[PDB]
From Swiss-Prot:
One of its GO terms (cellular component) is extracellular exosome. Lipid transport protein in adipocytes. Binds both long chain fatty acids and retinoic acid. Delivers long-chain fatty acids and retinoic acid to their cognate receptors in the nucleus. A fatty acid binds at residues 125-127. This is Fatty acid-binding protein, adipocyte. The keyword Phosphoprotein applies. The modification Phosphotyrosine is found at residue 18. GO terms for molecular function: fatty acid binding; hormone receptor binding; long-chain fatty acid binding; long-chain fatty acid transmembrane transporter activity. It comes from the Eukaryota. Monomer. Homodimer. Interacts with PPARG. It holds the Pfam family Lipocalin. InterPro entries: Calycin, Fatty_acid-bd, ILBP, Lipocln_cytosolic_FA-bd_dom. SUPFAM superfamilies: Lipocalins.
Amino acid sequence: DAFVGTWKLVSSENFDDYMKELGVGFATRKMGGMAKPNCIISVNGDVITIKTESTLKNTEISFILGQEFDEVTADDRKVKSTITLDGGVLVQVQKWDGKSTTIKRKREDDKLVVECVMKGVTCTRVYERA
Ligand SMILES: O=C(O)c1cc(C2CCCCC2)c(OCC(F)(F)F)nc1C(F)(F)F
């Protein structure tokens, strides 16, 4: 849809703090911080796929809006994830060990803006079309 495409990371703010609040250790944070991923979003019928590709780490999720699914995150959390579309924003929550984090994806001008929240930390990542 508005989201379909191949997107390249162009800016990131507070990602290290976000990962630290998730409990990610130094080595994985190091990898994550200097990753410049592509994000490839596609849709086929009810099923949306989001691939995140980078030199040292790839991930992929496929889901139906509103249907919880199991996910292994890039930092190796085993979470229960649910993604919904609200006012044009793809809102993902991940739940594990009584914690949650939200990842909101929205389209703004030429950007795919990703806002990641864990407790008091807010990270903003901006992707542009490849
Ligand atoms: O899409 C993103 O840019 C993104 C990317 C990553 C990984 C992707 C592979 C390379 C390293 C970074 C990620 O990892 C999960 C955690 F941050 F927790 F490590 N979380 C997100 C985001 F939160 F924003 F969805």
